[PDB]
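To close the chapter, one final illustration. This time we ask the reader to focus less on the individual chains and more on the assembly as a whole: which components sit near each other, and how the overall shape emerges from the parts.
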Amino acid sequence: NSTAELEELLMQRSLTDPQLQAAAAAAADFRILPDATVIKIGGQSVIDRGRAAVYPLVDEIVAARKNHKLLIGTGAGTRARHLYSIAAGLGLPAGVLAQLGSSVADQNAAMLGQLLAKHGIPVVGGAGLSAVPLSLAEVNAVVFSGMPPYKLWMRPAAEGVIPPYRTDAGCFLLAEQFGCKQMIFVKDEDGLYTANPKTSKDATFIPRISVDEMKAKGLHDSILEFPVLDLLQSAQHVREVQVVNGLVPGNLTRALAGEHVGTIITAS
Amino acid sequence: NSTAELEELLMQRSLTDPQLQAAAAAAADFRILPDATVIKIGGQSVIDRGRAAVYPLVDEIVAARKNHKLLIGTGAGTRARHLYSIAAGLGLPAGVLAQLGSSVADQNAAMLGQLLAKHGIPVVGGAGLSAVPLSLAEVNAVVFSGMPPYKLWMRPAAEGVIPPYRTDAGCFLLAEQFGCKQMIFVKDEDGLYTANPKTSKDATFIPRISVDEMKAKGLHDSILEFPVLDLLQSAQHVREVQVVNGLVPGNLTRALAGEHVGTIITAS
Amino acid sequence: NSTAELEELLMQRSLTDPQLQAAAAAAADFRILPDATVIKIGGQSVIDRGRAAVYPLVDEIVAARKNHKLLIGTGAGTRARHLYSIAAGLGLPAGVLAQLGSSVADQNAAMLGQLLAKHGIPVVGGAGLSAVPLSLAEVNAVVFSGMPPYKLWMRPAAEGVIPPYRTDAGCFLLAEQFGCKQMIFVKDEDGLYTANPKTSKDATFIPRISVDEMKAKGLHDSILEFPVLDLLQSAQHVREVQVVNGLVPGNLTRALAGEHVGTIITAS
Amino acid sequence: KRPIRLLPWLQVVKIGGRVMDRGADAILPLVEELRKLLPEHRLLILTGAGVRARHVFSVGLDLGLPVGSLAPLAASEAGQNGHILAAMLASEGVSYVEHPTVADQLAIHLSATRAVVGSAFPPYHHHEFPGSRIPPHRADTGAFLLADAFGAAGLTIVENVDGIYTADPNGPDRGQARFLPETSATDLAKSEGPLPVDRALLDVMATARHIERVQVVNGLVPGRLTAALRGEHVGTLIRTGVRPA
Amino acid sequence: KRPIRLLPWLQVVKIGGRVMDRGADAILPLVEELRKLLPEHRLLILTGAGVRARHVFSVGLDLGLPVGSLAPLAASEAGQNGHILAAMLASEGVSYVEHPTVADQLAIHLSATRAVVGSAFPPYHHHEFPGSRIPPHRADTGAFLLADAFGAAGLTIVENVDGIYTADPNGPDRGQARFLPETSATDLAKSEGPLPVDRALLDVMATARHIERVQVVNGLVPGRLTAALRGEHVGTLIRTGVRPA
Amino acid sequence: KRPIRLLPWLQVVKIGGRVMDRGADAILPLVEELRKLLPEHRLLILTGAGVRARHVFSVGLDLGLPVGSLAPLAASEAGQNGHILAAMLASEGVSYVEHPTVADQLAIHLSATRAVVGSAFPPYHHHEFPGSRIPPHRADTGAFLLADAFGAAGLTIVENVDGIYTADPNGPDRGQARFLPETSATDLAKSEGPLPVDRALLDVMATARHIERVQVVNGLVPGRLTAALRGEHVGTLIRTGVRPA
Ligand SMILES: Nc1ncnc2c1ncn2[C@@H]1O[C@H](COP(=O)(O)OP(=O)(O)OP(=O)(O)O)[C@@H](O)[C@H]1O
Ligand SMILES: Nc1ncnc2c1ncn2[C@@H]1O[C@H](COP(=O)(O)OP(=O)(O)OP(=O)(O)O)[C@@H](O)[C@H]1O
Ligand SMILES: Nc1ncnc2c1ncn2[C@@H]1O[C@H](COP(=O)(O)OP(=O)(O)OP(=O)(O)O)[C@@H](O)[C@H]1O
Ligand SMILES: Nc1ncnc2c1ncn2[C@@H]1O[C@H](COP(=O)(O)OP(=O)(O)OP(=O)(O)O)[C@@H](O)[C@H]1O
Ligand SMILES: Nc1ncnc2c1ncn2[C@@H]1O[C@H](COP(=O)(O)OP(=O)(O)OP(=O)(O)O)[C@@H](O)[C@H]1O
Ligand SMILES: Nc1ncnc2c1ncn2[C@@H]1O[C@H](COP(=O)(O)OP(=O)(O)OP(=O)(O)O)[C@@H](O)[C@H]1O
Ligand SMILES: [Mg+2]
Ligand SMILES: [Mg+2]
Ligand SMILES: [Mg+2]
Ligand SMILES: [Mo]
Ligand SMILES: [Mo]
Ligand SMILES: [Mo]
Ligand SMILES: [Mo]
Ligand SMILES: [Mo]
Ligand SMILES: [Mo]
Ligand SMILES: [Mo]
Ligand SMILES: [Mo]
Ligand SMILES: [Mo]
Ligand SMILES: [Mo]
Ligand SMILES: [Mo]
Ligand SMILES: [Mo]
Ligand SMILES: [Mo]
Ligand SMILES: [Mo]
Ligand SMILES: [Mo]
Ligand SMILES: [Mo]
Ligand SMILES: [Mo]
Ligand SMILES: [Mo]
Ligand SMILES: [Mo]
Ligand SMILES: [Mo]
Ligand SMILES: [Mo]
Ligand SMILES: [Mo]
Ligand SMILES: [Mo]
Ligand SMILES: [Mo]
Ligand SMILES: [Mo]
Ligand SMILES: [Mo]
Ligand SMILES: [Mo]
Ligand SMILES: [Mo]
Ligand SMILES: [Mo]
Ligand SMILES: [Mo]
Ligand SMILES: [Mo]
Ligand SMILES: [Mo]
Ligand SMILES: [Mo]
Ligand SMILES: [Mo]
Ligand SMILES: [Mo]
Ligand SMILES: [Mo]
Ligand SMILES: [Mo]
Ligand SMILES: [Mo]
Ligand SMILES: [Mo]
Ligand SMILES: [Mo]
Ligand SMILES: [Mo]
Ligand SMILES: [Mo]
Ligand SMILES: [Mo]
Ligand SMILES: [Mo]
Ligand SMILES: [Mo]
Ligand SMILES: [Mo]
Ligand SMILES: [Mo]
Ligand SMILES: [Mo]
Ligand SMILES: [Mo]
Ligand SMILES: [Mo]
Ligand SMILES: [Mo]
Ligand SMILES: [Mo]
Ligand SMILES: [Mo]
Ligand SMILES: [Mo]
Ligand SMILES: [Mo]
Ligand SMILES: [Mo]
Ligand SMILES: [Mo]
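The assembled structure is written out below.
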């Protein structure tokens, strides 16, 4: 390959041309925010539970940003499920539901941000390029709303009108785009099990698994949005994710310290 | 009370229900920016006077932010009075006047902000959650425009179309909402007197007074917007305010140091 | 003169009145960001060249901001020339072309900003009053898009529809407005020559020249937009500019250190 | 004189958030009724918040947040209801418009099309008044402030009940709840119990300059909104105390 | 060829800030005249700044601020005048529109309604040109730049005087002020004294591509704006120097 | 049931960026054809990006930037093409509208005027999907996602070629390129070579709910867009696989 061969293909072919696609794949790979970790704080699993769940995580975030640069994204939760129920019952399409769910993730970012403001940590749009906050020891963290931007241009699922890319996908793709070193989903279970632990009494804990193994066992749409597993397999930068229980004191702190709490899900 | 009793009332009653209102009043009380002081820099009383008044206050702000986190709001002044006169003469309602007056407070914030920019102090929207500036020793202060957001939805006064909530109310409510420790109004008189000191030769200085005492003497609408006195009586966080003369060198510095310059007005 | 004489003229005369114009000219002169340097990073001359040109300049910027406060503006380049060609061929006026060219400078600011984000340096709107970034040693620099705001209200040139005020003018006027100490244009030639060095083999290098001397030799529209030379002659604060070759390793570093690389062009 | 009327030909209609909460069973008939009204009136349709605002209050209060934090969080739910209702009317030319657009450009938008939808909450936001931990200036109040500032021809409030009763007709004392065909704001302001309208609505009625009456009608009964917009008495009339010039 | 005309059917009308400063006594008759013009023309109405900009210049200059700081501060006053004028015309479908909307979406807005109001100041802002401590590109200049970029059918400037005189007719030398029914921009550009129009207006006239003449008329005399919009000579005609293709 | 149609009377037309790249020789006839279509259809006209996006990809890839950086950079070029096309139609009441306006207020804008222009790229931005270093959700894909979400009456794609061939008809193998009058998305999705449409277009066709066919026609041949908007077969029909209810 070469720059010239690539620029010639870029000028002379469709972007769909396999030859152009292959020349592009040989391009250099810049990581924009390589030393940051993206964390998703669950909507239904954490923020909807109020003080008992959120306050200890705020204390963990405040402590952790001393050693760790954090992009903290919010989930949506029960108010988005309510919006989806109303709008789906009216026959509205996935793209309209997508906009509705963004508002709920925004509410949750506001509430978390107000608990963090006196500690210097802002709510932002554009977390990945929130260069000033992330370069300051007094700050070193930002909060953002976890829904993706697709809104009316959301691709629907194969069935139904629930948007398939919601705040797990939003947060994951930000980590991937900015070339972050780590992606931690903070939920309300210890990690992945062989069945739904809330539903099934004898579910077995899984410390580590690949996306292919998850699909081969039928765990495609469990504790993570199943579309995130496919995004994970295509990812250039973030090739595994960790799922942890934010309700366990210190669990987020320990995951940031390299402890293998929860479940690690690998692209391959 | 309990969380459950509250959530049940929140689901089953009108928000107007006395029972729900009382359960809500027992909720925990978080202060978002407890270590900050809100200062209002008068429009007519200070910024309209130009260099002689503004430059020394800029020097005081620059010095003070070394020891004190400041949210600095601007008043509006003679150009807003001109807008109000034109618009009231056309029969325009209070809500339209309210928008007009915002622009003048914005001008004044711009002018102050440009004198402060080389000292690292920004003009912001969202002062109360200006988490990054307020957490930095190099900064520790922000400037904001002091009018409230109500615009066309401004409640009118009982008589006339002048907006009753202007920049004293704007600044006060920000202090109250963010749970700030102190609210200082910077004007062009030493504090409150028994009569208008510009009009009355033998007015007596009042160092300290309650809102009820002010009303009982007929001082409801003097050196502060009278609606601010009512807001002050309803406030959860900021239960007194201090009024000081920004034209006296160091007066703002000394008020921030806990000196009882000027007048202290208490909710009760 | 006096404040009173000035305020009386401001109230009683047209702004076109020579008497008022002269009283205004005696006003005090505040420099908003006196310790900053504005740098323009060429679009065609640098960013369009990709990695080989841009990466070393990013390293220089990162090193330089340790000792120097920088406002870094982007040029536009070949994609703007393409837009201008399409739109001029349709008969569109200069004001419409002006908007189109802004988008290309914005693209270039985005790309530079993403290479600088991990070093704490943001892309901003409002560079001149980017008070917080510029007051931090961890930051001390911002990137902005170099086109002026005039858009549809762009004054056309005497001939043709190419906007006459583009990113050299945009950057220069920001330096001038904020009273910056220095303006450095970073291009792809060592400085000014007696003829176009790309076109003419025996062009002679000019280390230092005035705007009048440039016009007297016919160099009005060479390595700088000719309208910038006129702006330079009217400027209050920035009365010379330096043109340097960003393709030479360290050239920007050395110009910031007071070395006379390149060409210095003086108002008088 | 009282201030001039800015949009004297405007009808404002506030749709309760709890009506929207009933989903398609309530919304589809309301949408069909609104469709038939488009040729008859120039409509600003404003939505309230409903049950999701109670949930965000539950969370926000548990986190200790002040009343100025809760106000925009509730307002969001009213905006989402407005986007849902506007989507159902899009094929008739109706869209949701934002608060700045309502405040500054409503005249051009109602020249472009027959109706627009907006959020009924007012932008009090972090400058909401202290005292109660529940934001006092809510959807009824916001809609009335706009209607009266514009000098609109009317404000009609569309509820999930027939109107105002002497007690909550879905509550513990519903046995003694008597329907009130007509009432004044001042009489209501001196009662203590719950109402289907904001208490702050009564306050802004006292300082009103134009709107003389506001009718509360049952949006679950087809035809009542249409009748109310013609002045017919089909719910509770609230007299504001404003008199003609 | 010269650039095409974007909105060849547009009439642009610039209302002086000092006309607005006279309050209801001037504004009400102007509003009545504009109301009667709405069915006759497709109007972009742009307001200037007037006396409040002189006050913010007084303060800003006393604080030492540069000319690029003063430009947006003055522009604000023109925007407020535009909001006042639009409010008076709201019942006729007229609203204020922002500069980005004027620059990119005027065609759809004048399809929605008969007229819109905007600020006549151009967005030069902190990129205002240096030289004078007073912003040179003001309301006359902004309005002309738009009118000519759009290729509008005309620009009429509405003043508080009959037109241009050989000296300020309200000034120390008003005794020798002779009225000028017609003049060229180049002749004006070489005079030194005050004018009722920006000197930068003459500069942008020199580089103009479409507008051949601009009439300055007295907005305090009812009917002159109407007559000017029909081409009748009732104030001072300024010839820009543009010729027909 | 499938979701309702929001704007069932809408026709969406996507104009290729490489058509705009041909300049006046292509654009002027297209603009004249669009002018004549304004009274016949309610049009959302969406522009793609063309050759300038290839240049910003060249630079961005040389700088190592990821696919989510390149997506908005390309989208910019589509927006500029939309501003150019809208300017040419301004005298007919047409303007460019931004993505939030398209997503939330298209109904009021197509009540105000007969057509509007927007960018065909979808706002995937930094949340573009990984895998390829070239943004997959481009202008064809964005236009289809909107058309199908709205339940539009059609989407017509205006190309610089007659339609889809079995090989690139301007490429090394153009000798063996056979024209395809009709094809299905699923058949196309299993081919490997280049296409004149995004491969992601085929993916969003598979999950579509309303649009049954999309015609690709040559915008360089006057009259083909007009014919396609009436259902006439003048290019390549792509069957999405959606069936009637
Ligand atoms: N196989 C499984 N293993 C572990 N947990 C599972 C499994 N299947 C389902 N779950 C459940 O999925 C839930 C995670 O989904 P949930 O929507 O609560 O996450 P969230 O991040 O809170 O989403 P949002 O943030 O949008 O509300 C967990 O509460 C967990 O009990
Ligand atoms: N009883 C009183 N005691 C002291 N001062 C009084 C009294 N009554 C009236 N005043 C006057 O009220 C003035 C304060 O109002 P003013 O509008 O100047 O404040 P401001 O903060 O400058 O308002 P804005 O900032 O919007 O212009 C003081 O100048 C003071 O002389
Ligand atoms: N007399 C001269 N001396 C030196 N250089 C000259 C002269 N005349 C023309 N030039 C050329 O002008 C060019 C600078 O213009 P160019 O548009 O490349 O700058 P730019 O800052 O990259 O603009 P943009 O940033 O908008 O692309 C230099 O490449 C230089 O070769
Ligand atoms: N005196 C009363 N008369 C009638 N209804 C009452 C009264 N007191 C309480 N209510 C209750 O108020 C309920 C209406 O609820 P509410 O007013 O909160 O909903 P909404 O108006 O739809 O919501 P939003 O204010 O967010 O638009 C009625 O169903 C009734 O149960
Ligand atoms: N040669 C002149 N002919 C006519 N008027 C003049 C002349 N020179 C000065 N003037 C003064 O200009 C005044 C008009 O003021 P000016 O042009 O500043 O106001 P405006 O156009 O309303 O304001 P803005 O420019 O903010 O819209 C006239 O009333 C007159 O006193
Ligand atoms: N199988 C094919 N059939 C037809 N054209 C093809 C095929 N494969 C490649 N092409 C090429 O695709 C070109 C069209 O280019 P492309 O689709 O990139 O432009 P566009 O649609 O105008 O751009 P944008 O996607 O930015 O709007 C045709 O001119 C042709 O050379
Ligand atoms: Mg109610
Ligand atoms: Mg004038
Ligand atoms: Mg194509
Ligand atoms: Mo949004
Ligand atoms: Mo937002
Ligand atoms: Mo917020
Ligand atoms: Mo925020
Ligand atoms: Mo931000
Ligand atoms: Mo936003
Ligand atoms: Mo947003
Ligand atoms: Mo946004
Ligand atoms: Mo920002
Ligand atoms: Mo960004
Ligand atoms: Mo952003
Ligand atoms: Mo930021
Ligand atoms: Mo920033
Ligand atoms: Mo604003
Ligand atoms: Mo603003
Ligand atoms: Mo500013
Ligand atoms: Mo600012
Ligand atoms: Mo900010
Ligand atoms: Mo703002
Ligand atoms: Mo604002
Ligand atoms: Mo805003
Ligand atoms: Mo911001
Ligand atoms: Mo905020
Ligand atoms: Mo904000
Ligand atoms: Mo900030
Ligand atoms: Mo910041
Ligand atoms: Mo920030
Ligand atoms: Mo822009
Ligand atoms: Mo922008
Ligand atoms: Mo960006
Ligand atoms: Mo950015
Ligand atoms: Mo910023
Ligand atoms: Mo910021
Ligand atoms: Mo922007
Ligand atoms: Mo912008
Ligand atoms: Mo902007
Ligand atoms: Mo910002
Ligand atoms: Mo700014
Ligand atoms: Mo800004
Ligand atoms: Mo900033
Ligand atoms: Mo900031
Ligand atoms: Mo908007
Ligand atoms: Mo807006
Ligand atoms: Mo705003
Ligand atoms: Mo806006
Ligand atoms: Mo704003
Ligand atoms: Mo706007
Ligand atoms: Mo806007
Ligand atoms: Mo903008
Ligand atoms: Mo906008
Ligand atoms: Mo913008
Ligand atoms: Mo916009
Ligand atoms: Mo917008
Ligand atoms: Mo947005
Ligand atoms: Mo907007
Ligand atoms: Mo937004
Ligand atoms: Mo807007």
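The CA atoms of residues 46 and 53 of chain B lie 6 Å apart. Residues B 122, 124, 133; C 132 surround molybdenum atom (ligand 50) (CB under 6 Å). With these observations in hand, you are ready for the problems at the end of the chapter.
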